[PDB]
Design a protein around this ligand. Sequence first.
Ligand code: SF4
Ligand code: SF4
Ligand code: SF4
Ligand code: SF4
Lengths: 438, 449
Amino acid sequence: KNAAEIRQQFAMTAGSPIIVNDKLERYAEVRTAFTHPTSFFKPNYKGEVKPWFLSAYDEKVRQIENGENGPKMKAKNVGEARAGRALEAAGWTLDINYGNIYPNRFFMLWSGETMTNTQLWAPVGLDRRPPDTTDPVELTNYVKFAARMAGADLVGVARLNRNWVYSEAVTIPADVPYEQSLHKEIEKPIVFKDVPLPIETDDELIIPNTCENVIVAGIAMNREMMQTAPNSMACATTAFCYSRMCMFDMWLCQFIRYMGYYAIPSCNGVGQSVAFAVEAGLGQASRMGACITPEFGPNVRLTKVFTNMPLVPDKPIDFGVTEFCETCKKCARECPSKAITEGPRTFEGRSIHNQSGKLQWQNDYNKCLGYWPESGGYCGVCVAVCPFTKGNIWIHDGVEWLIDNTRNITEVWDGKINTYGLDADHFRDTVSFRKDRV
Amino acid sequence: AEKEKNAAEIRQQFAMTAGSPIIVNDKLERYAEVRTAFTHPTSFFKPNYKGEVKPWFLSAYDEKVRQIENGENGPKMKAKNVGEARAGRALEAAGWTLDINYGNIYPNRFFMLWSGETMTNTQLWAPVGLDRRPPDTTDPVELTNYVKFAARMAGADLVGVARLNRNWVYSEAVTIPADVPYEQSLHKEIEKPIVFKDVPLPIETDDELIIPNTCENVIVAGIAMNREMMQTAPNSMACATTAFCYSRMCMFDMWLCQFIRYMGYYAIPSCNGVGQSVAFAVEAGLGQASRMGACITPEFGPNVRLTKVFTNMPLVPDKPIDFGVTEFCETCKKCARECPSKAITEGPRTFEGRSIHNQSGKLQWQNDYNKCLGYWPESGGYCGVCVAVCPFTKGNIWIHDGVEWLIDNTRFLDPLMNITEVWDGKINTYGLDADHFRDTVSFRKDRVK
Ligand code: SF4
Ligand code: SF4
Ligand code: SF4
Ligand code: SF4
């Protein structure tokens, strides 16, 4: 089992793998099921219509009171039910409003100037000193090393494709306090202009034309916990990884700034992570819609940082995911809301929530979100059942690597765990030396 | 055949019976935090390389800047080029992103809030009421398993529980007034007593930081640093693994406190504040005190950072461990010989503090920590040479003789009988090492008995 060998073997020639037509336009973030007016409101189990996450809260409370870890899933006792939800809620500590999407707010600042760390370090002047390194080869090695220090299990670099950057972001006015944020979300254009630094005006989020590159990180979720989907421990590994995303973005942006460049964090905001991840060679797009990686399958979170730092783009990877998803359809059969299509890929979105103009499996994401208040979590059954999520799907026939075609919650709490939920049985797969960084 | 290393076995073999291992006598009094070398007026000021007397960290900054300009990664250590020198300091600086003023010591300020109520996460989750609902679990056995599982999720490589020994809680904390903005914080530090009272929840008044008498337990976490980077001490990459682990500590405290709160209990974070981490770690069984003064663990030696959380959550205390560190430190003295400031004693343990920076009244090796801090502006970093040269920091110390585990004495022979390569070499997530990561795997049996 050698991940470096595997990635080398399945490396493509250069060029975005995403097939597009002339109808493709940048996508307004408000259109996602989380935020759009058509999908935002959902009934709770009492028949009261609320913001989807508030109705999901009502189900978490009902489950705790009834000693359940998920829908129709009895916990060992009320204590266990409570612990799962306590772990879930805690995981989100370093995340704003489920995904950190508002750009240049809270943790996602587009400049480091006001950060306590930057202020403390100001006399050294690292963020003001011109770069001492402009060589993209050395920079790629440096920033990838920093990325691993910052908590990425996978890291890749692509040229920034503006097609995947949201046309308009969901955000809040800059002087609105957190307690009012959910009630004062607004739309705001993201535009590219000839300016020296990322800047936000009253009217626009402005990314410089010099913002050449995107650095994409994979943040691995815990297999045992995700396999409890749609129950509470799947929610907990999801949540902890969002806080890991946030710390990754801040750490890496600060490193890049202290190297003499600018850096834009994003977590779930600014653009479509799956498209960037595919273009940066982390994995391939799949039927369920996720980026499937050789190391973790789809059981990995994504975040990304945009920068003018000169870098060497990674090659896209083709290890046969498209052909496997063609015949598999297991996520689609197991999906509790029938959100995932069993049909062929097309360029035409199923609803407002899809971006038309790119060849993909088109899924109904309102159907997906509808299951979240019903189950009181973030589901994840598709991730859990995907063959690529299983530990070792990789075999070697003596010449090369190939996919092996052949492929409760109390026990999780009482079972194997390790730091950040990583697994020492597999952790060697993400070891890195210079040769695999650049 | 070679027996595969079993860290759980090793800890079981060397487990002690219950009781604080730290030997004390009647001169022992709680220690005022302002006495540490970082904060005390006698030690706080250090000359820079031009002889200008400044706050120690400002003089160290001057040296970092000088090194970058001169293409160096440390004192008299030439870098590959200026770009490499720059990169090491950029990585170091970035590492500190989630840490306030080198340690997060001010209690109930910034990240170290003693209540979760104002946190954005708590506000978002308020409708579920997890922080208001009485505990559904009071069994200390189940709580210990739950909270240790949460601790591993929250980034701890080691976790242990002890009853809170107030002897190691600072008598007065270093902090700032609540109305003082971050940019003035380093100018406006004050002392505030930490007191124990019959109150329901941790609370701060104008005059006191008040910990409830019900605050029974301390949870101690070990946060592993990176071996390859620390072995570059006193140069910049050792500074970088130090820095990143401080931000990991902060994340750990906030994550774990929120879990404990959402379980229906209260929780006090601390990072480098509130009390003496080495003493708590020893009492919680993470490892043993050592000549250099650090807690030496079987897994990482001293090359591991510590943080701690205080709580009324019922828990099962862990047993202390004795794997012979004291007897090795008695005869080894490598850290003392290699220390660039001669801060570490080569003499025996005593109950008498060397200077104001030591807490008298506990049996320990007494080191001169003003001498230690003095080397930091000189070298432009946080040194760490003692951690780097300690044989317990090597990954290779444990052997099995067919009957039991033991320490390989050959690793202590004296004499034994670069930074570019680190940047170009092995790394993995959070700087953890997959060659050793199995050592911190955990099942219920090793979380609670
Ligand atoms: S379950 Fe099957 S069809 Fe769905 S994403 Fe995984 S491999 Fe593709
Ligand atoms: S998360 Fe659940 S409901 Fe949503 S697509 Fe996956 S399986 Fe279906
Ligand atoms: S170097 Fe030797 S004396 Fe110093 S702490 Fe390590 S084992 Fe003890
Ligand atoms: S950090 Fe350096 S100066 Fe301080 S005690 Fe250790 S070796 Fe000596």
